[PDB]
Ligand binder design. Structure first.
Ligand code: UQ8
Length: 175
C-alpha cells in the first residue's frame, strides 16, 4: 500500500500573516499526516484544527470563521511522484521536482505549480521541502471573506490576503 509514511513529529508546515504595517507572524499546523503510495501518489494531510498562532482566541477564530473546520477539518495535498527517481537518489543527493500539486482547501481544489527539493538522508528517509518561496492567495480558496471577518473582529485596518507557506517534510520507507 505505502512506499513511504510521513514522519509526523519531525515534519512542519508554517504560514505567514501580515497585519497593520508589515507586522509579520509565522503560524504552524501542529498535526500533519501523510504518505506515498506504491502507485506513486504522495499525500500531505494538514489538520486545520491544529492551527497554532500562539493565541488561543485567535486560533479559535481561525478554526471557526476562516477554515470553517466543522465543515473542513483537513486540507489535503496530492502530488504524483516518480518512485524510481526517488529510489535512485544516492544518500545525501538532492533533485528538483516540478509539480502540479492539488491542494484541497476550504472546499476548493486548486493546483499549486511549484518546485520541490527532494533529498535522500538515508536508505529509508527523504526530506521534501518547497525549493522556492511559495505564496497562497486567500481568494483562490474563497478565504478572503474569512480574512475580512478576522480583520473586523480584531479592529485592524488591514490584513494581507497573500500568505507565504513553507514546509519541511520527512517521509520514511518501511524499516
Ligand atoms: C485576540 O487575538 C487576535 C490577534 O492578535 C492580537 C489578531 O491579530 C487577529 C487577526 C488575525 C490575523 C492577522 C491572522 C490572519 C490569517 C491569515 C491572513 C491566514 C490565511 C491563511 C491562508 C490563506 C492559507 C493557510 C495555508 C495553508 C492551509 C497551507 C496550504 C498548504 C500548502 C500551500 C502546501 C502545498 C504542498 C505542496 C506544494 C507539496 C507537499 C509535498 C508533498 C505532498 C510530498 C511530495 C513528495 C515527493 C517525493 C516529491 C485575531 C482574529 C485575533 O483574535
Amino acid at each position: 500500500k505505502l512506499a513511504y509514511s510521513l514522519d509526523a513529529t519531525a515534519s512542519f508546515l508554517n504560514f505567514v500573516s501580515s497585519k497593520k504595517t508589515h507586522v509579520l507572524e509565522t503560524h504552524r499546523f501542529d498535526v500533519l499526516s501523510g504518505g506515498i503510495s506504491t502507485a506513486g501518489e504522495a499525500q500531505l494531510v494538514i489538520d486545520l484544527n491544529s492551527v497554532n498562532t500562539g493565541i488561543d482566541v485567535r486560533n479559535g477564530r481561525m478554526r471557526d470563521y476562516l477554515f470553517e473546520t466543522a465543515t473542513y477539518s483537513v486540507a489535503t495535498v496530492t502530488v504524483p511522484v516518480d518512485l524510481a527517481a526517488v529510489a535512485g537518489l544516492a544518500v545525501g543527493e538532492d533533485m528538483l521536482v516540478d509539480v502540479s500539486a492539488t491542494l484541497d482547501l476550504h472546499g476548493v481544489p486548486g493546483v499549486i505549480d511549484t518546485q520541490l527539493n527532494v533529498q535522500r538522508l538515508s536508505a529509508t528517509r527523504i526530506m521534501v521541502q518547497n525549493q522556492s518561496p511559495l505564496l497562497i492567495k486567500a481568494a483562490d480558496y474563497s478565504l478572503e471573506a474569512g480574512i475580512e471577518t478576522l480583520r473586523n473582529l480584531a479592529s485592524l485596518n488591514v490584513i494581507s490576503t497573500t500568505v507565504p507557506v513553507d514546509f519541511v517534510l520527512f517521509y520514511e520507507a518501511p524499516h
